[PDB]
Each structure stands twice: as structure tokens, then as C-alpha cells.
Design a binder for this molecule. Structure first.
Ligand SMILES: [Zn+2]
Length: 215
């Protein structure tokens, strides 16, 4: 007997997956959607533990805005709301060099999609951490009302992105990318956070106090 509450994915808190030792699992349990078919517990656990590095208040903001992060085993282009992307070139790639079938995440809307097994840099994307980068887009646009467009953030981007991302075109020249990748550096590890702090100290402080900038 399969219930319709699990037919299209399972909310983490309803999944029976054991997350009791994960910080903020009470909040993440209402944000993360896991597959209703077989998936790797190790891959899901690592993704959820990375998201649990985020300031609890930001997670609460995301939950109260009803942002969800759906973890997938199959490609994003098998989801009906992304089916139009099958076989198409993603913006910014040379045609023939990439299709949306090969893109493992999408962020910015109230539903974030992340395919399991692709977190690290180079696995179909160029971010230090796929799930933090994509979630940061949705935070930026929804919780923080396009904060990458504010005068304060624009000035951080101008002054510090050339120091932090001199060799990474999209993180250097797109303010929404600078926001999302800076967020991922702050939260993926202590080592990347200290890299951010040394190369881009004002951006570091901006991310550290981000929770006080919501709307
Ligand atoms: Zn991005």
C-alpha cells in the first residue's frame, strides 16, 4: 500500500531516514524531499549534513517561506516541470558541448532540484558545492529579495570578486553567482570559509550576518 503523500517524493521528516544526529534536523525535515524510489543513504546523508552547516535561522527563514530542496536519483529533465529542457543546450554553454540532461541542479525558485552524487566541483557544474550553491540562489531571490542587486552587495562584488575568483568567469562577472558561490565557500568547510575571509573579508562578513538582511 503506497500513499499518495509519497508518490511524488517524500518529505524528509516523513521518510523514516534517521537524521537525529544532524544539527537542525527538525527544520531540514520540512525542507528536504527525498526520493520515493531506491537511493543512496550515504549520498543523501552527506548532502543533508552539508545543508545543516547553515545558520539555523536561515534554515528557519527558508522553511517559513516554504522553500524545498528535492534530492533526485534521476536527471532533472525527467521531472515533468523540467521536461522542456531535455536535449537542449543550457545558456552559457557552446551548443554541442552540454545539454540540460547533464546539469545536476537548478536553484532560484521555491523548489530546488539537486541530483544525488554530484556535490563536488566538476561533477557537471563548476561550484565548490552544488547543494549550497543552488540553495543560495533561492535564498537570494526569495528570502533576501534579490539581495545581489543591492548597492551594498554590488560594491562588495566590485571590490572583492576580482580577488577571490580571478580565474572563474561566471563567479567573477555575475553578481548572483558571486553571492551563491560566496555562500557555498562560507558553509562547505572551515578551510573554504577561511579562504573567503582572507580574499574577500567584507563579503565574508556580509554572509556571516546574512540572516539579519531578510524581508
Ligand atoms: Zn548559479
Amino acid at each position: 500500500p503506497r500513499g499518495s503523500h509519497m508518490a511524488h517524493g517524500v518529505l524528509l521528516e516523513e521518510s523514516g531516514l534517521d537524521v537525529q544526529t544532524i544539527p537542525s534536523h527538525d527544520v531540514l525535515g520540512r525542507i528536504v524531499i527525498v526520493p520515493e524510489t531506491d537511493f543512496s543513504f550515504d549520498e543523501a546523508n552527506e548532502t543533508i549534513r552539508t545543508l545543516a552547516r547553515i545558520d539555523r535561522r536561515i534554515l528557519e527563514q527558508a522553511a517559513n517561506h516554504h522553500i524545498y530542496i528535492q534530492l533526485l536519483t534521476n536527471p532533472i529533465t525527467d521531472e515533468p516541470i523540467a521536461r522542456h529542457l531535455r536535449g537542449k543546450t543550457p545558456r552559457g554553454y557552446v551548443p554541442g558541448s552540454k545539454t540540460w540532461d547533464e546539469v545536476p541542479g537548478i536553484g532560484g525558485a521555491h523548489l530546488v532540484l539537486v541530483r544525488l552524487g554530484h556535490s563536488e566541483k566538476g561533477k557537471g557544474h563548476g561550484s565548490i558545492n552544488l547543494e549550497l550553491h543552488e540553495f543560495a540562489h533561492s535564498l537570494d531571490y526569495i528570502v533576501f529579495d534579490h539581495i545581489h542587486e543591492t548597492d551594498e552587495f554590488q560594491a562588495l562584488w566590485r571590490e572583492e570578486a576580482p580577488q577571490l575568483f580571478p580565474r572563474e568567469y561566471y563567479f567573477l562577472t555575475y553578481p548572483e553567482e558571486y553571492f551563491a558561490e560566496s555562500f557555498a565557500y562560507y558553509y562547505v568547510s572551515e578551510k573554504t570559509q577561511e579562504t573567503l575571509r582572507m580574499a574577500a573579508p567584507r563579503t565574508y562578513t556580509f554572509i556571516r550576518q546574512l540572516a539579519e538582511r531578510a524581508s
